[PDB]
Design a protein around this ligand. Sequence first.
Ligand SMILES: [Mg+2]
Ligand SMILES: [Mg+2]
Ligand SMILES: [Mg+2]
Ligand SMILES: [Mg+2]
Ligand SMILES: [Mg+2]
Ligand SMILES: [Mg+2]
Ligand SMILES: [Mg+2]
Ligand SMILES: [Mg+2]
Ligand SMILES: [Mg+2]
Ligand SMILES: [Mg+2]
Ligand SMILES: [Mg+2]
Ligand SMILES: [Mg+2]
Ligand SMILES: [Mg+2]
Ligand SMILES: [Mg+2]
Ligand SMILES: [Mg+2]
Ligand SMILES: [Mg+2]
Ligand SMILES: [Mg+2]
Ligand SMILES: [Mg+2]
Ligand SMILES: [Mg+2]
Ligand SMILES: [Mg+2]
Ligand SMILES: [Mg+2]
Ligand SMILES: [Mg+2]
Ligand SMILES: [Mg+2]
Ligand SMILES: [Mg+2]
Ligand SMILES: [Mg+2]
Ligand SMILES: [Mg+2]
Ligand SMILES: [Mg+2]
Ligand SMILES: [Mg+2]
Ligand SMILES: [Mg+2]
Ligand SMILES: [Mg+2]
Ligand SMILES: [Mg+2]
Ligand SMILES: [Mg+2]
Ligand SMILES: [Mg+2]
Ligand SMILES: [Mg+2]
Ligand SMILES: [Mg+2]
Ligand SMILES: [Mg+2]
Ligand SMILES: [Mg+2]
Ligand SMILES: [Mg+2]
Ligand SMILES: [Mg+2]
Ligand SMILES: [Mg+2]
Ligand SMILES: [Mg+2]
Ligand SMILES: [Mg+2]
Ligand SMILES: [Mg+2]
Ligand SMILES: [Mg+2]
Ligand SMILES: [Mg+2]
Ligand SMILES: [Mg+2]
Ligand SMILES: [Mg+2]
Ligand SMILES: [Mg+2]
Ligand SMILES: [Mg+2]
Ligand SMILES: [Mg+2]
Ligand SMILES: [Mg+2]
Ligand SMILES: [Mg+2]
Ligand SMILES: [Mg+2]
Ligand SMILES: [Mg+2]
Ligand SMILES: [Mg+2]
Ligand SMILES: [Mg+2]
Ligand SMILES: [Mg+2]
Ligand SMILES: [Mg+2]
Ligand SMILES: [Mg+2]
Ligand SMILES: [Mg+2]
Ligand SMILES: [Mg+2]
Ligand SMILES: [Mg+2]
Ligand SMILES: [Mg+2]
Ligand SMILES: [Mg+2]
Ligand SMILES: [Mg+2]
Ligand SMILES: [Mg+2]
Ligand SMILES: [Mg+2]
Ligand SMILES: [Mg+2]
Ligand SMILES: [Mg+2]
Ligand SMILES: [Mg+2]
Ligand SMILES: [Mg+2]
Ligand SMILES: [Mg+2]
Ligand SMILES: [Mg+2]
Ligand SMILES: [Mg+2]
Ligand SMILES: [Mg+2]
Ligand SMILES: [Mg+2]
Ligand SMILES: [Mg+2]
Ligand SMILES: [Mg+2]
Ligand SMILES: [Mg+2]
Ligand SMILES: [Mg+2]
Ligand SMILES: [Mg+2]
Ligand SMILES: [Mg+2]
Ligand SMILES: [Mg+2]
Ligand SMILES: [Mg+2]
Ligand SMILES: [Mg+2]
Ligand SMILES: [Mg+2]
Ligand SMILES: [Mg+2]
Ligand SMILES: [Mg+2]
Ligand SMILES: [Mg+2]
Ligand SMILES: [Mg+2]
Ligand SMILES: [Mg+2]
Ligand SMILES: [Mg+2]
Ligand SMILES: [Mg+2]
Ligand SMILES: [Mg+2]
Ligand SMILES: [Mg+2]
Ligand SMILES: [Mg+2]
Ligand SMILES: [Mg+2]
Ligand SMILES: [Mg+2]
Ligand SMILES: [Mg+2]
Ligand SMILES: [Mg+2]
Ligand SMILES: [Mg+2]
Ligand SMILES: [Mg+2]
Ligand SMILES: [Mg+2]
Ligand SMILES: [Mg+2]
Ligand SMILES: [Mg+2]
Ligand SMILES: [Mg+2]
Ligand SMILES: [Mg+2]
Ligand SMILES: [Mg+2]
Ligand SMILES: [Mg+2]
Ligand SMILES: [Mg+2]
Ligand SMILES: [Mg+2]
Ligand SMILES: [Mg+2]
Ligand SMILES: [Mg+2]
Ligand SMILES: [Mg+2]
Ligand SMILES: [Mg+2]
Ligand SMILES: [Mg+2]
Ligand SMILES: [Mg+2]
Ligand SMILES: [Mg+2]
Ligand SMILES: [Mg+2]
Ligand SMILES: [Mg+2]
Ligand SMILES: [Mg+2]
Ligand SMILES: [Mg+2]
Ligand SMILES: [Mg+2]
Ligand SMILES: [Mg+2]
Ligand SMILES: [Mg+2]
Ligand SMILES: [Mg+2]
Ligand SMILES: [Mg+2]
Ligand SMILES: [Mg+2]
Ligand SMILES: [Mg+2]
Ligand SMILES: [Mg+2]
Ligand SMILES: [Mg+2]
Ligand SMILES: [Mg+2]
Ligand SMILES: [Mg+2]
Ligand SMILES: [Mg+2]
Ligand SMILES: [Mg+2]
Ligand SMILES: [Mg+2]
Ligand SMILES: [Mg+2]
Ligand SMILES: [Mg+2]
Ligand SMILES: [Mg+2]
Ligand SMILES: [Mg+2]
Ligand SMILES: [Mg+2]
Ligand SMILES: [Mg+2]
Ligand SMILES: [Mg+2]
Ligand SMILES: [Mg+2]
Ligand SMILES: [Mg+2]
Ligand SMILES: [Mg+2]
Ligand SMILES: [Mg+2]
Ligand SMILES: [Mg+2]
Ligand SMILES: [Mg+2]
Ligand SMILES: [Mg+2]
Ligand SMILES: [Mg+2]
Ligand SMILES: [Mg+2]
Ligand SMILES: [Mg+2]
Ligand SMILES: [Mg+2]
Ligand SMILES: [Mg+2]
Ligand SMILES: [Mg+2]
Ligand SMILES: [Mg+2]
Ligand SMILES: [Mg+2]
Ligand SMILES: [Mg+2]
Ligand SMILES: [Mg+2]
Ligand SMILES: [Mg+2]
Ligand SMILES: [Mg+2]
Ligand SMILES: [Mg+2]
Ligand SMILES: [Mg+2]
Ligand SMILES: [Mg+2]
Ligand SMILES: [Mg+2]
Ligand SMILES: [Mg+2]
Lengths: 47, 271
Amino acid sequence: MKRTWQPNRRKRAKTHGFRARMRTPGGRKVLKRRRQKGRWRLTPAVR
Amino acid sequence: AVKKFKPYTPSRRFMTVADFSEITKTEPEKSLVKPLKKTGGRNNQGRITVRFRGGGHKRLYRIIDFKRWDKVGIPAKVAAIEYDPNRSARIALLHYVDGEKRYIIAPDGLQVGQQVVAGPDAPIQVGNALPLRFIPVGTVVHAVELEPKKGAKLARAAGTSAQIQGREGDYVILRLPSGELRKVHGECYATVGAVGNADHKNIVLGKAGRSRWLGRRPHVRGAAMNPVDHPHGGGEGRAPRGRPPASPWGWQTKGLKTRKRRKPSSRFIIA
RNA sequence: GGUUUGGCACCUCGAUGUCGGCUCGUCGCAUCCUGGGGCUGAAGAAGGUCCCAAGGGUUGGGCUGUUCGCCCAUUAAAGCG
RNA sequence: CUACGCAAUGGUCGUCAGCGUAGGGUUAGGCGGGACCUAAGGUGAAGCCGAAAGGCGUAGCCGAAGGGCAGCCGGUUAAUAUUCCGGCCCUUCCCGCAGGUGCGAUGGGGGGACGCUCUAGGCUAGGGGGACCGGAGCCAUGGACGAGCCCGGCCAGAAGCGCAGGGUGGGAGGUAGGCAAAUCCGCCUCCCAACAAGCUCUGCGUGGUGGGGAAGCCCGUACGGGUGACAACCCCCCGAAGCCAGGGAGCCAAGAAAAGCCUCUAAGCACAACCUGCGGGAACCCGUACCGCAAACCGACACAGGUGGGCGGGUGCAAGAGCACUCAGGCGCGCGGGAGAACCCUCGCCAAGGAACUCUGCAAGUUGGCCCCGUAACUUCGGGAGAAGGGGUGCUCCCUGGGGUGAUGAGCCCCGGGGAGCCGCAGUGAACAGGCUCUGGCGACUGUUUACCAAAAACACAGCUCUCUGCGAACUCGUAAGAGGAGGUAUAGGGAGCGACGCUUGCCCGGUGCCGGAAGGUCAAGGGGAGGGGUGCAAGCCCCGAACCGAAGCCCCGGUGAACGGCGGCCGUAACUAUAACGGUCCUAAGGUAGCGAAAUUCCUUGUCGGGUAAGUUCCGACCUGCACGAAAAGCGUAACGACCGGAGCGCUGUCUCGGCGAGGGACCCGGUGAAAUUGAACUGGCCGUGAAGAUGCGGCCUACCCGUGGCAGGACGAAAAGACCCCGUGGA
RNA sequence: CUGGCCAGGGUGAAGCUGGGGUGAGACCCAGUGGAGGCCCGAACCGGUGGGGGAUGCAAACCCCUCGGAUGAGCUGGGGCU
RNA sequence: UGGAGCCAUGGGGGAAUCUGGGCGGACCACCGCCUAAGGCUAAGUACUCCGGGUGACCGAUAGCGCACCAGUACCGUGAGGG
RNA sequence: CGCGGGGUGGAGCAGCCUGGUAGCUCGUCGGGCUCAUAACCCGAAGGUCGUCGGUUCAAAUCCGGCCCCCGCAACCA
RNA sequence: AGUAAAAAUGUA
RNA sequence: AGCCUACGGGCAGGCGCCGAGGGUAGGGCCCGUGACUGGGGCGAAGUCGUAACAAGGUAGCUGUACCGGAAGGUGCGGCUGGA
RNA sequence: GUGAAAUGCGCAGAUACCGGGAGGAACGCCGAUGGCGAAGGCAGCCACCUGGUCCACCCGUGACGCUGAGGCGCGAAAGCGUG
Ligand SMILES: [Mg+2]
Ligand SMILES: [Mg+2]
Ligand SMILES: [Mg+2]
Ligand SMILES: [Mg+2]
Ligand SMILES: [Mg+2]
Ligand SMILES: [Mg+2]
Ligand SMILES: [Mg+2]
Ligand SMILES: [Mg+2]
Ligand SMILES: [Mg+2]
Ligand SMILES: [Mg+2]
Ligand SMILES: [Mg+2]
Ligand SMILES: [Mg+2]
Ligand SMILES: [Mg+2]
Ligand SMILES: [Mg+2]
Ligand SMILES: [Mg+2]
Ligand SMILES: [Mg+2]
Ligand SMILES: [Mg+2]
Ligand SMILES: [Mg+2]
Ligand SMILES: [Mg+2]
Ligand SMILES: [Mg+2]
Ligand SMILES: [Mg+2]
Ligand SMILES: [Mg+2]
Ligand SMILES: [Mg+2]
Ligand SMILES: [Mg+2]
Ligand SMILES: [Mg+2]
Ligand SMILES: [Mg+2]
Ligand SMILES: [Mg+2]
Ligand SMILES: [Mg+2]
Ligand SMILES: [Mg+2]
Ligand SMILES: [Mg+2]
Ligand SMILES: [Mg+2]
Ligand SMILES: [Mg+2]
Ligand SMILES: [Mg+2]
Ligand SMILES: [Mg+2]
Ligand SMILES: [Mg+2]
Ligand SMILES: [Mg+2]
Ligand SMILES: [Mg+2]
Ligand SMILES: [Mg+2]
Ligand SMILES: [Mg+2]
Ligand SMILES: [Mg+2]
Ligand SMILES: [Mg+2]
Ligand SMILES: [Mg+2]
Ligand SMILES: [Mg+2]
Ligand SMILES: [Mg+2]
Ligand SMILES: [Mg+2]
Ligand SMILES: [Mg+2]
Ligand SMILES: [Mg+2]
Ligand SMILES: [Mg+2]
Ligand SMILES: [Mg+2]
Ligand SMILES: [Mg+2]
Ligand SMILES: [Mg+2]
Ligand SMILES: [Mg+2]
Ligand SMILES: [Mg+2]
Ligand SMILES: [Mg+2]
Ligand SMILES: [Mg+2]
Ligand SMILES: [Mg+2]
Ligand SMILES: [Mg+2]
Ligand SMILES: [Mg+2]
Ligand SMILES: [Mg+2]
Ligand SMILES: [Mg+2]
Ligand SMILES: [Mg+2]
Ligand SMILES: [Mg+2]
Ligand SMILES: [Mg+2]
Ligand SMILES: [Mg+2]
Ligand SMILES: [Mg+2]
Ligand SMILES: [Mg+2]
Ligand SMILES: [Mg+2]
Ligand SMILES: [Mg+2]
Ligand SMILES: [Mg+2]
Ligand SMILES: [Mg+2]
Ligand SMILES: [Mg+2]
Ligand SMILES: [Mg+2]
Ligand SMILES: [Mg+2]
Ligand SMILES: [Mg+2]
Ligand SMILES: [Mg+2]
Ligand SMILES: [Mg+2]
Ligand SMILES: [Mg+2]
Ligand SMILES: [Mg+2]
Ligand SMILES: [Mg+2]
Ligand SMILES: [Mg+2]
Ligand SMILES: [Mg+2]
Ligand SMILES: [Mg+2]
Ligand SMILES: [Mg+2]
Ligand SMILES: [Mg+2]
Ligand SMILES: [Mg+2]
Ligand SMILES: [Mg+2]
Ligand SMILES: [Mg+2]
Ligand SMILES: [Mg+2]
Ligand SMILES: [Mg+2]
Ligand SMILES: [Mg+2]
Ligand SMILES: [Mg+2]
Ligand SMILES: [Mg+2]
Ligand SMILES: [Mg+2]
Ligand SMILES: [Mg+2]
Ligand SMILES: [Mg+2]
Ligand SMILES: [Mg+2]
Ligand SMILES: [Mg+2]
Ligand SMILES: [Mg+2]
Ligand SMILES: [Mg+2]
Ligand SMILES: [Mg+2]
Ligand SMILES: [Mg+2]
Ligand SMILES: [Mg+2]
Ligand SMILES: [Mg+2]
Ligand SMILES: [Mg+2]
Ligand SMILES: [Mg+2]
Ligand SMILES: [Mg+2]
Ligand SMILES: [Mg+2]
Ligand SMILES: [Mg+2]
Ligand SMILES: [Mg+2]
Ligand SMILES: [Mg+2]
Ligand SMILES: [Mg+2]
Ligand SMILES: [Mg+2]
Ligand SMILES: [Mg+2]
Ligand SMILES: [Mg+2]
Ligand SMILES: [Mg+2]
Ligand SMILES: [Mg+2]
Ligand SMILES: [Mg+2]
Ligand SMILES: [Mg+2]
Ligand SMILES: [Mg+2]
Ligand SMILES: [Mg+2]
Ligand SMILES: [Mg+2]
Ligand SMILES: [Mg+2]
Ligand SMILES: [Mg+2]
Ligand SMILES: [Mg+2]
Ligand SMILES: [Mg+2]
Ligand SMILES: [Mg+2]
Ligand SMILES: [Mg+2]
Ligand SMILES: [Mg+2]
Ligand SMILES: [Mg+2]
Ligand SMILES: [Mg+2]
Ligand SMILES: [Mg+2]
Ligand SMILES: [Mg+2]
Ligand SMILES: [Mg+2]
Ligand SMILES: [Mg+2]
Ligand SMILES: [Mg+2]
Ligand SMILES: [Mg+2]
Ligand SMILES: [Mg+2]
Ligand SMILES: [Mg+2]
Ligand SMILES: [Mg+2]
Ligand SMILES: [Mg+2]
Ligand SMILES: [Mg+2]
Ligand SMILES: [Mg+2]
Ligand SMILES: [Mg+2]
Ligand SMILES: [Mg+2]
Ligand SMILES: [Mg+2]
Ligand SMILES: [Mg+2]
Ligand SMILES: [Mg+2]
Ligand SMILES: [Mg+2]
Ligand SMILES: [Mg+2]
Ligand SMILES: [Mg+2]
Ligand SMILES: [Mg+2]
Ligand SMILES: [Mg+2]
Ligand SMILES: [Mg+2]
Ligand SMILES: [Mg+2]
Ligand SMILES: [Mg+2]
Ligand SMILES: [Mg+2]
Ligand SMILES: [Mg+2]
Ligand SMILES: [Mg+2]
Ligand SMILES: [Mg+2]
Ligand SMILES: [Mg+2]
Ligand SMILES: [Mg+2]
Ligand SMILES: [Mg+2]
Ligand SMILES: [Mg+2]
Ligand SMILES: [Mg+2]
Ligand SMILES: [Mg+2]
Ligand SMILES: [Mg+2]
Ligand SMILES: [Mg+2]
């Protein structure tokens, strides 16, 4: 059956992208939250 | 006249279609005026605000002239009459002598060729627009302004029309399609005659599509939903409301009046 | 007597699947046939009734989810638990 | 891709590999994105709004399988190619020269430009024949040296040509419009011209010429290399859903935008500048391996699942992307080897019977294509219809009628018609391929639904009625701005119920709701302050506070049922008896009309009669003492429709009496790899009894050598899940 | 918002055309035509009945069967709640 | 909400400049305190990313989640888990 | 069977709560009007207040015991 | 400026 | 593949058409019968009213429509067979 | 309002009167034992379109006539469908 995950690069970047995260204050916090934590990727990696 | 079909398939035994005889000599809109991408969409910024809308054939908006005082005294020959997917009415494409041309809600009686115009003067005969005041107390008219230089806003649905009952001050009394008696201003334009295509009210959609073709989605009854959805909802085994006919939002729907109590628009009405 | 309807609430609610059927049986005797037998208001044939006796038998359909019934056509009998 | 490898990964093995180590490998002005355009939407100068965070939002900007834009055919690599190479053909920019012309926009106009279904005429793609062309070869096993068998008979190609089509009137006057600024559009007027021509623009054919070019044989791990002939490269036929394309006709639901591109002019500027030529220069960034219906993507896996577009050959079957076989190409599913038990799965057949099976013909069988006769009630005249029920169906030879292509003749295709005759059990000889009818219920109908137990009588539905709403509409979302409604305007929009259609839809406004009622009754803040109090020697400063005036709402008055709803009791009475047309009385707001009625509703109940059966708690027809129908939570009907639920027949059957045999995959044996839930420990038997009331573990008695393997499922109150039921909790939702 | 897909059969509406008809009509026959939430049935969409599967191939599968299949149709990409 | 002042203020009304004006828990009269409707101002106070010093603190199931190449592997669309 | 409503002249309803008073309508009997009978008119009669007991000074009336009539209810398994 | 109230039923 | 021959041929025999009739299926016409139901006819005895004939005590009658225990009432128009 | 009454309407201001406006239906007097039409049936006035009918002249055609199963059209009122 079709499953939940259907990879799409444009979607992924547009949705969880660094740029996107920056526009919303809620997103900005995510970034802050992560950096603060020490993550190696603030954003989902995807080329 | 409304065409009818033999019953060679149900949902087409009763189905009926308007008789497109009048339109003729032009089906493809005026690439000049009309050429306006109409925006389709059943709600505002985000959420749906008007239930059951959507789907339904593509549609281009024909930009029409709802205020005729633009070209006073300038006449124009009625070049053609076309189909307009955006209204009950039909519309007449007319060519002003200015060379300029525009669309007008085609009134019953209008003929191609038949020249027409609008102005305080203007011959009191179908297709001509004149400030309500300069109109023979009685004659029927449609496409009426409600406030001077604010555009036509009354009686524009196929076959609708208002009749001049009389005068009284700078105002004139109209008996609107609905039947209410209102005092419109004198300077309020209005084009003489009735809307036409009066046969409209007579079409029988026929199937459930067709209702779809017109962008009208299915309408699910309150009592069919559950307590959480509508107030008529709930009830083991079909039941009967539970008193007293209400809408999904809570207000009663049988009787209860809605117009703003202290509205200043009142005192201009009487029906 | 422990097959009914119940009474009580003792094991089981960190679970004892709760009607009917089908398959497979097995046991009881308070015996439906079949074998013995005593009375009889037993002439004979056929019954009634009680006694001994399960070794083995104890049909196929209609209706109903049914158990049970009712019915159809049989049977030595179409037993009850 | 290649060279070394095999620990692990691979459900076995493993020299192999998508695995390990290493080295290579992805080449573009023309393909695809970007230095182009705009869509939904996003963002967002201005501007509005918001406690902050922020929310709207014009222009503009971003945003693309949509618009626009110049590459075809071959050749090479172990691995890239419209990218490198060869031949052929284009595109832009920049500079120069020559000749043209009022050149010139972020502006004006045109154009770009649009649906659905059906379609004409030509073409090409693709395919089939050929006695013709070219070619290694081949006569086997009884026959054939044969018009034998076998293999291949193409691709691209500028200009120029032909053949199809597509677009398009030419003039000259005015001109109040295109937010005029135009010689352009648009409008009026009139010499002209025409179901054209002319001029343009595609497609196709042709084209200088350049490529390609089998079978078989020889070499050959691999992959491929000469061969191959100086190869031939021709003739008919079939033929698109593709091209000519913006073709045509019909239809209602009425079918993007912007730039490129023409043209018109404004500033400007004409020693500009654009235009057509012709030379010479310039032409960046990013992707290019490989997988790609799958072992490389989504599913923890080399997972029987999921995944958009194009090509997808041949023969036969009426057609076809269907079915059988088969090209090219790709595979045999990464545990095998034997046996020949029960049992399971999937599959084949069966005497007589033929639904007796069972909740139920569940399942399975029967039937099946096409041609031809021939078909009922009922009906909304469409349908019911594939109703039913029959006949035909292969091959051979002869005669004969049309159509397409030719050329009116010929082969080549496409539909037919009539005769005789042949062989089988059987001719849609295999594969795909309805069983039928009668009668009820519900719903009108196609459609929708519980992703993962419900596809329905449920939702939706056209249609009917009520109700709101006069437009800055009602209504919805939002604090607002704003937005939907609607760039709509009562023949419209919102809400509600009913649910095609037919005949219909009664009585009750007491209560509730809503609608109408400038009177009254009651009524808050506030206005008013009679009168009273606290203090001061006081002027005063403070407090309470009665009349009366004071909205909406409620009261009161009246309306209203396709608004919420409701729509009686007890006695008596007619030639036998029954029953009660009739009457009495109490109550009510008014006491259920038509039509239906043991029903999706009837408890008693398998009511009582009829029908159907040998037999009928079901089914169908009736009767009505309707526990407990009834008119828009519609009432009674209804042709057609239904994977809906019921009752019947006929047909045919392994459903069954009643089972038998056979096949394949497992099960079983051997070699390889090798889990799981569960598990207090165990040295874990029967019966009577006892015990917390159902014991391997107590008592008595009985039986019982130690250990396995294939099987069965009665027990271990067997597993699983801290019971959904039940109750409890001053638990939750 | 923008694209794409739906083998092949079947039935044969309105219109046209011609004839008949009448005073003119309605209408009636043919032929043409190719309508439709039409019929059969692949792809494509779905999930009716049965069987299998139940530590599965699979945390919804497989086979047989069945429904829709020009439409209220299916579907890719880009969006919004 | 209290007898409810004081301090602040959304609404309405709306002064005075030292005979001015607030307060001392309603309100008056006494007596007394203080000068609103402009602004600034170190120090003593808080915390611990960082550096150092100690410890009747742990000693690799402890001690931070990490003594180790850890906010990693891995899981999740993601926030996030770890 | 469990809560609850009811039995009063011949029929159908009050009166019970607020105990000492049996009311109303129709029918039945007598007399008129009429030729006659309905109707209409005038006049009378008729009730253990289901039943057995209790409270009281007195019970249709209030308190329990049965007798019947009517109406709700009888659910989760 | 003479339209205009009600009052059933019965054969031996 | 027989039988007679006068060898041309006839006969037996074999095949086919048609064919009484039987069978299956689906129709048409008529008859009998059927739980129950609908009216109708006559009724020497019933129950309810009294509609019509005299203004029959509301002129009657009528096509139609509705409504009512029943006759019948009422509406729209019409007739005189009423004044 | 009737026989007389009652329902009902009105002190929320009715009935009676005046002014104004909306709307629908019907057309008093003329009007008659009247006229027209085939029948049903037809009444304010105006116009347009149109049928039948009568009189005078004896002008024209030259028996071209009458009736009429069926067919066809019309056809009060009530009734039905759609608006
Ligand atoms: Mg997952
Ligand atoms: Mg993408
Ligand atoms: Mg790093
Ligand atoms: Mg938006
Ligand atoms: Mg609905
Ligand atoms: Mg529901
Ligand atoms: Mg919700
Ligand atoms: Mg409610
Ligand atoms: Mg609610
Ligand atoms: Mg219910
Ligand atoms: Mg409810
Ligand atoms: Mg027992
Ligand atoms: Mg017991
Ligand atoms: Mg217990
Ligand atoms: Mg106890
Ligand atoms: Mg338990
Ligand atoms: Mg346990
Ligand atoms: Mg037994
Ligand atoms: Mg014995
Ligand atoms: Mg004897
Ligand atoms: Mg190797
Ligand atoms: Mg291995
Ligand atoms: Mg490798
Ligand atoms: Mg761009
Ligand atoms: Mg742009
Ligand atoms: Mg935009
Ligand atoms: Mg924004
Ligand atoms: Mg693009
Ligand atoms: Mg493109
Ligand atoms: Mg490759
Ligand atoms: Mg090249
Ligand atoms: Mg120019
Ligand atoms: Mg344009
Ligand atoms: Mg060939
Ligand atoms: Mg030979
Ligand atoms: Mg060529
Ligand atoms: Mg074509
Ligand atoms: Mg632009
Ligand atoms: Mg650059
Ligand atoms: Mg590649
Ligand atoms: Mg697949
Ligand atoms: Mg594909
Ligand atoms: Mg594998
Ligand atoms: Mg797979
Ligand atoms: Mg799918
Ligand atoms: Mg697919
Ligand atoms: Mg073929
Ligand atoms: Mg075929
Ligand atoms: Mg296939
Ligand atoms: Mg091969
Ligand atoms: Mg058999
Ligand atoms: Mg047989
Ligand atoms: Mg049989
Ligand atoms: Mg049976
Ligand atoms: Mg049985
Ligand atoms: Mg079946
Ligand atoms: Mg049918
Ligand atoms: Mg039928
Ligand atoms: Mg053959
Ligand atoms: Mg051809
Ligand atoms: Mg077939
Ligand atoms: Mg079939
Ligand atoms: Mg019925
Ligand atoms: Mg039934
Ligand atoms: Mg349905
Ligand atoms: Mg489901
Ligand atoms: Mg379904
Ligand atoms: Mg209806
Ligand atoms: Mg607000
Ligand atoms: Mg709008
Ligand atoms: Mg609506
Ligand atoms: Mg509406
Ligand atoms: Mg319904
Ligand atoms: Mg009634
Ligand atoms: Mg009421
Ligand atoms: Mg009311
Ligand atoms: Mg009322
Ligand atoms: Mg009110
Ligand atoms: Mg006050
Ligand atoms: Mg005082
Ligand atoms: Mg008030
Ligand atoms: Mg009696
Ligand atoms: Mg009697
Ligand atoms: Mg009832
Ligand atoms: Mg009835
Ligand atoms: Mg019955
Ligand atoms: Mg019932
Ligand atoms: Mg019953
Ligand atoms: Mg029952
Ligand atoms: Mg019977
Ligand atoms: Mg049977
Ligand atoms: Mg019976
Ligand atoms: Mg049965
Ligand atoms: Mg019945
Ligand atoms: Mg009902
Ligand atoms: Mg009703
Ligand atoms: Mg109702
Ligand atoms: Mg219904
Ligand atoms: Mg019914
Ligand atoms: Mg079905
Ligand atoms: Mg369906
Ligand atoms: Mg059936
Ligand atoms: Mg086997
Ligand atoms: Mg092994
Ligand atoms: Mg024991
Ligand atoms: Mg022991
Ligand atoms: Mg023991
Ligand atoms: Mg064992
Ligand atoms: Mg087992
Ligand atoms: Mg067990
Ligand atoms: Mg257990
Ligand atoms: Mg528990
Ligand atoms: Mg549950
Ligand atoms: Mg035709
Ligand atoms: Mg269809
Ligand atoms: Mg189909
Ligand atoms: Mg099929
Ligand atoms: Mg395809
Ligand atoms: Mg679904
Ligand atoms: Mg599928
Ligand atoms: Mg299935
Ligand atoms: Mg299902
Ligand atoms: Mg299953
Ligand atoms: Mg199963
Ligand atoms: Mg199918
Ligand atoms: Mg989509
Ligand atoms: Mg997307
Ligand atoms: Mg303040
Ligand atoms: Mg203030
Ligand atoms: Mg001063
Ligand atoms: Mg203060
Ligand atoms: Mg103070
Ligand atoms: Mg103080
Ligand atoms: Mg103090
Ligand atoms: Mg102080
Ligand atoms: Mg200061
Ligand atoms: Mg200060
Ligand atoms: Mg400071
Ligand atoms: Mg510190
Ligand atoms: Mg640690
Ligand atoms: Mg250690
Ligand atoms: Mg650390
Ligand atoms: Mg740790
Ligand atoms: Mg993951
Ligand atoms: Mg991840
Ligand atoms: Mg009594
Ligand atoms: Mg008397
Ligand atoms: Mg009397
Ligand atoms: Mg309960
Ligand atoms: Mg009588
Ligand atoms: Mg007599
Ligand atoms: Mg015969
Ligand atoms: Mg009969
Ligand atoms: Mg009779
Ligand atoms: Mg009698
Ligand atoms: Mg009478
Ligand atoms: Mg009378
Ligand atoms: Mg009448
Ligand atoms: Mg009446
Ligand atoms: Mg009359
Ligand atoms: Mg007044
Ligand atoms: Mg005339
Ligand atoms: Mg003569
Ligand atoms: Mg009428
Ligand atoms: Mg009616
Ligand atoms: Mg009508
Ligand atoms: Mg009407």
